[PDB]
């Protein structure tokens, strides 16, 4: 009731304008995305542009905060999310046939834009990608198309765990155990009600059963594995945090309340990659007192066993009365894929015609 | 006090139930071909609506929701609203039977009411041909123009006028009477109506009306490739709807335990006897209560045999941005060759939008 | 006081004259042909568009409603406006002529106004080529730039800057100050507009603006294979509309019978001398009037002999979920094959989005 909704024309309105600066920047990255680029600078292209086109907007309010509400990431075939690489990290080289995830989010006034989507580098012109690319792409696909259609008022979060692993099974993929898609409300990318792939049987206990209601926003997050689909850490450092609004510590230095003070200025509670401060050295230090008391909370590079390809398809979904409306989504050509493998379930053919 | 699709919470309970509708029908035009039971079908599409309606808005223990209109399945000459009972004759589906698939669903009473015609068993590659398609294209033409014209600021009037030019397009008529209702929560029979094809006499007994926004209507669509009247032929009538309207102590025991069980468990929203423990009891019971207008009866009303019946009924909420439709049958108008057209230029112009 | 789309009664009256712009300017550019008078178009489609808003909102008898831009046919190189009167020099249209069609309805006040350029008698299966192609896929491509551009938290400026980019790609020019208004009830002139390719001193007194949600505009592209000026040519003058800001008892009783009819007829939309039968006490009326600022005149505008001047205009409500356009031409880009493109990457991608 004091909370600003969807409820209202002005934030539809923000939630609106980020979303299709969002769209303009995932599409510009994927264009120039092909053999030899570095991604470490379409990492920093991305973040620039979010940065220059949240500047154009809204020029008469001159209060209104606006920017990066996910560090632009890039995380290539066995890779899953959160590769925002340092100036001095080393830098990955798109080759021909990798698979990209671009993962990004934009935000105007707190309401937040998250988007991701999945392709394949310099696919030759008159071609098809096909094999496990091609199933995995086709899988994390149908599984944004089963949640468009089941994430509305009335059904449960239950029902998408559900469609997603018979959607997934149909390709002999399997969704990544235990990923959350989050609802989103002002200032909060990571909202408690939420949607788990593949939970384990901790995982389905632990995690609690919600009804989507008319009025909510959430960033649907698909994320396909070919393989088994349990993410490890592999020694990639981390360079994506978020402050955790949550915990309070007072912090026994003075580089450490003097980082985690740019922190709360220049991002307040958005993720931020460590990449976007000036002095790299300097950030790297001051990362470690706050991290390990928690004020900041990661976001790790996780990956699948090397060979095997995971698939991210990433949209913010306002449920409005008149239906789900998509506001962010990623320039996907259903005919490029062939897989050999179909959905056979009778129920879920029909969910994905209708 | 009237709950109107300016709330945001009643837009949002109409398409959960239209989007439910849309459902079960595709699931049922699925399950049909030679030689499956009309009687299953009608079954198989009131335990679908049961299903759907009980998985959906359940942290709302308190929330009536369910069968708006039960499943009937109305085959060939068949008008509409046939829905055997168990101890009635069943009818077995035929390659190339013209099958009308009419059901509501309702979500705290607001209605979403859809129907659909096809043919069964369409041999792959084929197209249907001659009276079956023409009277299949009238109708489906005769619903694009409805949704067209169903609009804020146009008349009643202006559509019985476009269906009739539409249906003559294909000698075909629609059937004469037949009423398309506003829809309210808990109404599925507003005064508000358009009509088809009226008599001289029905169109004075008949009020013009003009459409406004926040208003749902179920428009419905019957077409004939006759004469477009339909006249009973003495099927029991198996669906009844309470009429709040009215008041009658009733008297003997089995009648009011079985009026008991209809306000119980269907309130205002029709219903099939078929769904009763006891389809020889429930028959009984029906006789008193519907004598003293406590129930109005759905009959089953049929044209002449050889001629063809086809329908389309959806349900729109006129919206402010413009009609939102909110069901649908899954028409392909490739499946359909008619050796006639609409040639009208204006009707042309408005079907192609 | 004011009504805004943020009502969901006004989104509607916009939809439904919307619709109806739609309808007339199809209607009108299947109607023209080699030999078809001007004169027959203009009176054709000011005929349709109060036909079309006599049919609706009949029950609300206070309610006005007709035309907002009176039917202007203007070809080639002239720019706008030109609505002959009865005892003007008529235009027959030739095969190979460019033909703009601008015109307007209202809806209790709400304006949709629409303008569409085409080719007369395009030989079935060919394209058109040379200066017409160029320009008109310049003036759509800056349609289609406006329509994207063109909603909340933008700038007018952003919209000029555009418009030069997408128009300098096919080497044509954006005419020199023309303007696109805000609309709101009752006003086609809103003091809040979009300038097409500014002069020097027309930046300095034209006003920077940020576009916000419930706004309405009437994005008007007005594109010149020449240099992008446009003159006056002692054209008879037809259209003007009342300034309802000044008020004068007016002397001669020709005038004020004259006044009375525009008051009655028009309200204080633009309208064309040609509606009035007695074409000699109207041209009287005027000069009294106008002599007075009681009307403000819609002069014809030419660009050079042998240049070619193409229009798209279109209605658009800023909607929180983002511009609802309510009116638009029949375009085929298919029909129209240039020798250039736009080549500026943002531009290429804007124009996909």
Redesign the interface.
Known sequence: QQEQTI?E??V??KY??GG?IA??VL??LV?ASSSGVSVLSLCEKGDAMIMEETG?????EKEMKKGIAFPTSISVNNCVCHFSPLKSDQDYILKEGDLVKIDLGVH?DGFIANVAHTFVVDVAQGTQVTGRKADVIKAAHLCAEAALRLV?????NT?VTEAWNKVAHSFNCTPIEGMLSHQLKQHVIDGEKTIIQNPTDQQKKDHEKA?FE??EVYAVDVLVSSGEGKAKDAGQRTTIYKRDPSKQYGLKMKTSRAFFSEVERRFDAMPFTLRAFEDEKKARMGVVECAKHELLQPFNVLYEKEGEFVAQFKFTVLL????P?RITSGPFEPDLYKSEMEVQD?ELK?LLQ?
């Not at 154009?56 to 008469?60: L, V």
């Not at 509305?152 to 449960?156: A, E, T």
């Open positions: 409820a024309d002005l539809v309105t609106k304008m299709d769209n303009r599409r510009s264009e154009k907007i809204f020029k008469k105007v509305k008022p009335g059904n449960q029902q009804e008319v009025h409005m009365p008149n239906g409306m009778a029909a209708s």
